[PDB]
Design a binder for these strands. Structure first.
Ligand SMILES: [Mg+2]
Ligand SMILES: [Mg+2]
Ligand SMILES: [Mg+2]
Ligand SMILES: [Mg+2]
Ligand SMILES: [Mg+2]
Ligand SMILES: [Mg+2]
Ligand SMILES: [Mg+2]
Ligand SMILES: [Mg+2]
Ligand SMILES: [Zn+2]
Lengths: 248, 93, 106, 69, 135
RNA sequence: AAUCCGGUUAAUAUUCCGGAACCAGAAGGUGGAAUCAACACGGCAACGUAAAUGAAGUUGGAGACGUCGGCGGGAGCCCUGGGAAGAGUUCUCUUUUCUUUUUAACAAACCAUUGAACUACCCUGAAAUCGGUUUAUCCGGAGCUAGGGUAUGGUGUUUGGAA
RNA sequence: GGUACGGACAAGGGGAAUCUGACUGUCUAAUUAAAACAUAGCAUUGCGAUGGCCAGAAAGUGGUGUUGACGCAAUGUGAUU
């Protein structure tokens, strides 16, 4: 057989379309001011980022060591506005938009763009409408427990920073796309992943699902976790299948 | 005159896509094209510019607001703010 | 009636191939190749176009006299009049507040 | 090309060293154009009078080259 | 209760001297034929003196500690009043609505203001007045 | 960054010729301007001028941006009424029918007049009996209407070029 | 007045039903344009980054990723009801 489509997604025509993107959305390099105090920035712009649901905020900070201003690109939280002051650091207040160590915020606070490691500059809860919940602190050997959008519980060090509030851009997925063309335009600014041909619509040379005098898979579509590339298609390492009626 | 009993703004789609789909789009489209009130200026000159971005007109408060995809504020964001404010006001005192 | 041709080898209606029709003193209808239109500088705080300054391509500004490229006022040619007024009042009031907060700190 | 609206201004430009030559153009409408060729510009003065044209022609520097069209 | 009165220090907010600190000389609350609005006659600092330190020489300090003043009639709406006020020794009746009609009297009034402002700068009793506002 | 017209050859031309310009760089050749101690004045203001010292550093702007829809102006074209010059037709008719009746880059002054603005901004003033207003319903105590100003300025006007 | 006149030119035939694919879109260049493919919608699967999927002979190597579950990856079904 030939190299299946999933195996060809290794670069080339499958790279991300990034010309129209203004910059990665990052927290700010963890520095002396944030470790010990706070630093104030002003929201200069709130902008659309092609390929991203959530809007981005360009935030201007004074450089502590040089006569210069540093512009940061943040994931905008809902409620943020241009001209707003945001404060980042250990002593920042618990206000929507501020950036604080998760260990400095009480249990139950709603946060976004949370670091997995202290200083990684934001990993968790970044897509539109998403957030992370503080679940508890363990002061001895400081580790904070958080709930992720997937429902998983994670332990981050109580120095990983987070942004107070929910990512802006609301309930985007509530609107039916309604048309192939709208899906076309959504993925045109993302990557070459649409439209998708079904495996069973192919010939055996193309896909493990291909071939047959009717369109059918043949063997089970739940394939083992340790399948080789080229046979790892369908429902990979599925714990179960079918329409769930009540889950947790 | 009424010009439409049901489809409203979704009349542009005609008979395509299915009634339920057009009805769901109709509820969202009415939201995303509505005018909302600016809390900082008091005028109803708040309209959307691209999905989470709500702008204001006039010579005053040319600011831009980060909001929901289809409405200026979401219920989740509003509930989070009061939750955050309660938590802020209980460690403060 | 008289029909025209591009005077350059650029054969396509691009933004660098702008033209307009002239009638010559030989009674000839022909193209004149013209530049893109200029742009007035914009306020750094509000984005409004700044008054008192002509709309030119960027390098044409190198040929004007100094006073044609600015306004005789603080931040002239860089900030609008109303933006400067906001800055002056804001700076004064904030400085005064820093004075009272220092006085009441002791 | 530049137009000169004052006879005093035109005579001053003629007395300058760049002023090589002058031209006299007599239009059908009995108006007379005095054209001064400098290095960069050609300066025209429109004289609408024949009496004034004669006085201006006599008012020129004596060494100036005045050419008739 | 009247914010704008002679001796008060104000900030110009519009015009060529925007951001320059001025002292009110006359407060014409009612509008005249020339300037039909609540205007004031003011004297302000067009060029503030430069800071001087102990390492400077004597001649250099003299150069830096100079004031170039201006005199102007300003609409009240183009003034931001302050809380400071100046003493206004001999700038009492020297700048009326008549020195502006004559450039000779204008230069004479400015020279007089320059002398009092400069002497007032040395031995600083109003330091805030001669420090530029940064904005 | 910056070039136009007219002409010219068997055959090149925004390249040659005639005429008229423009840009960039270098040196500084004159003239002017400011400065007697220091780097100009005017205007309430928007902002104005023939010039109007400005190193490092910083910040801002221009370059610089989709698509559809109608509305308003300009230029060339098209059409039309006279005059002129030549031509076609003319048993009869046709004060007829046809052709020509042109004006560049660049420079200057004006400029919503004559066509397109209350477009943006400023000043006075303080609006319910609310008014203003687009084909399209937006605007106003965060200052409407009105009155007067300031700026943006040509493929507009009047000229130079240029008959 | 030729009972003629969108006078040439230009320029829809219409209706009642059944099978089938919802629709617009796409392909066997040179025998197949379709009921095939795609599609919105519906559902399932993996994965919280010391990760999932993909790559490379190797690497102090690459893609997804200017990304973070309202995401990326892997399948099925095929608008609505
Ligand atoms: Mg097949
Ligand atoms: Mg196979
Ligand atoms: Mg040839
Ligand atoms: Mg079909
Ligand atoms: Mg075929
Ligand atoms: Mg065929
Ligand atoms: Mg199918
Ligand atoms: Mg279905
Ligand atoms: Zn507002």
């Amino acid at each position: 057989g030939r190299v299946i489509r999933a195996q060809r997604k290794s670069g080339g025509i499958f790279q991300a379309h990034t010309r129209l993107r203004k910059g990665a959305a990052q927290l700010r390099t963890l520095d002396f001011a944030e470790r010990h105090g706070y630093i104030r920035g002003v929201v200069q712009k709130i902008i659309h980022d092609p390929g991203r649901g959530a809007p981005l905020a360009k935030v201007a900070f004074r450089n502590p060591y040089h006569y210069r201003t540093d512009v940061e690109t943040f994931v905008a939280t809902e409620g943020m506005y241009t001209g707003q002051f945001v404060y980042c650091g250990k002593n920042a207040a618990l206000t929507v938009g501020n950036v604080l160590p998760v260990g400095e915020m009480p249990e139950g606070t709603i946060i976004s763009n949370v670091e997995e490691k202290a200083g990684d500059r934001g990993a968790l809860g970044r897509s539109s409408g998403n957030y992370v919940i503080i679940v508890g602190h363990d002061v001895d050997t400081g580790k904070t427990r958080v709930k992720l959008p997937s429902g998983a519980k994670k332990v981050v060090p109580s120095s990983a920073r987070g942004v107070v509030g929910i990512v802006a851009g609301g309930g985007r997925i509530d609107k039916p796309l309604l048309k192939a063309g709208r899906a076309f335009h959504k993925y045109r600014v993302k990557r070459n992943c649409w439209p998708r041909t079904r495996g069973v619509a192919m010939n055996p040379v193309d896909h493990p699902h291909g071939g047959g005098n009717h369109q059918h898979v043949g063997h089970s579509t739940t394939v083992p976790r340790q399948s080789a590339p080229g046979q790892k298609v369908g429902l990979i390492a599925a714990r179960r299948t079918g329409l769930l009626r009540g889950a947790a | 005159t009424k010009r439409t009993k049901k489809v409203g703004v979704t009349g542009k789609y005609g008979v395509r896509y299915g009634a339920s789909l057009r009805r769901d789009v109709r509820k969202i489209e009415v939201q995303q094209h509505s005018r909302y009130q600016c809390p900082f200026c008091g005028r109803n000159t708040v309209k959307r510019t691209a999905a989470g971005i709500w702008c204001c007109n006039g010579k005053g408060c040319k600011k831009v607001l980060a909001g929901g995809a289809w409405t200026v504020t979401t219920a989740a964001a509003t509930s989070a703010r009061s939750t955050i404010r309660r938590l802020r006001e209980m460690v403060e005192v | 009636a008289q029909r025209v041709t591009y005077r350059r080898r650029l054969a396509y209606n691009t933004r660098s191939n702008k033209t307009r029709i002239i009638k010559t003193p030989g009674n000839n209808i022909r193209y004149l190749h013209i530049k893109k239109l200029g742009t007035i500088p914009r306020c750094g705080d509000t984005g409004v176009p700044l008054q008192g300054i002509p709309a030119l391509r960027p390098r044409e500004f190198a040929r004007l006299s100094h006073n044609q490229k600015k306004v005789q006022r603080a931040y002239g040619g860089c900030l609008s009049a109303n933006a400067v007024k906001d800055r002056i009042v804001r700076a004064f009031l904030i400085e005064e507040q820093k004075i009272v907060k220092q006085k009441l700190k002791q | 090309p530049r137009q000169i609206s004052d006879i005093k201004q035109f005579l001053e430009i003629a007395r300058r060293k760049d002023a090589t030559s002058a031209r006299i153009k007599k239009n059908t409408n009995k108006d007379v154009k005095f054209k001064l060729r400098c290095s960069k510009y050609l300066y025209t003065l429109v004289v609408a009078d024949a009496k004034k044209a004669e006085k201006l022609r006599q008012s020129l520097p004596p060494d100036l080259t005045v050419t008739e069209v | 209760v009247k914010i704008l009165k002679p001796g008060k220090v104000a900030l110009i907010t519009r015009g060529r001297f925007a951001g320059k600190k001025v002292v009110i000389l006359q407060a014409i609350d009612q509008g005249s034929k020339s300037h039909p609005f609540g205007h004031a006659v003011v004297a302000g600092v067009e060029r503030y003196p430069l800071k001087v330190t102990k390492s400077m020489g004597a001649k250099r300090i003299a150069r830096r500690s100079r004031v170039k003043p201006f005199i102007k009639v300003v609409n009240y709406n183009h003034l931001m009043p302050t809380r400071y006020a100046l003493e206004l020794d001999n700038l009492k009746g020297l700048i009326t609505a008549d020195t502006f009609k004559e450039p000779t009297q204008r230069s004479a009034a400015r020279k007089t203001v320059k002398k009092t402002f400069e002497e007032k700068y040395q031995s600083g009793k109003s330091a805030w007045f001669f420090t530029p506002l940064r904005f």
